[PDB]
Amino acid sequence: MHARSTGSYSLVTQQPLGGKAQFGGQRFGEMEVWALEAYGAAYTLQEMLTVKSDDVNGRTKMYKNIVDGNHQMEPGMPESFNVLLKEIRSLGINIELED
């Protein structure tokens, strides 16, 4: 048995380090993502990929919303994507988010 609502974040800023020794969250692997995509699941996918795992401006906002009464959500953008962008940019390849 191991249930954790919240815990210390990783270097990538993903909140669940994993395991029982250090409070962790069960990995929502690609297979579960595909299983959600098979249904009409779209909002739960967003809320399990951005506001639940790694969004420094989303997790605190949703915590404050939850402890206040309304269960809304601010999408934001995953920190791991910014980490990927920086890693690719450090490789001599210019990748940007065009508008």
């Binding site: 009409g40 009464g69 309304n70 269960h71 809304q72």
Partner: protein, 79 residues
């Protein structure tokens, strides 16, 4: 407590839209100060919204018309 939502999806065949149109009602009853139109049977806002949809009291058109009426009242309030 709504166990099966088949009666609710009769109103909206798409089913994906049914979730979207009930989220608005649930937010209106949770965040906004709108009383439910069905007898509140000690159920949460989501189940109340689904039950309201089943009876035919809440859909996209009716909710949009109510929002338009609220907008008109706001216009009257602001002179």
């Amino acid at each position: 407590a709504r166990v099966t939502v088949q009666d609710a999806v009769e109103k909206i065949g798409n089913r994906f839209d049914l979730v979207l149109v009930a989220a608005r009602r649930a937010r209106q009853m949770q965040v906004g100060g709108k009383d439910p139109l069905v007898p509140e049977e000690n159920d949460k806002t989501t189940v109340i919204a689904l039950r309201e949809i089943e009876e035919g009291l809440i859909n996209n058109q009716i909710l949009d018309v109510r929002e338009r009426q609220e907008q008109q009242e706001q216009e009257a309030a602001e002179l």
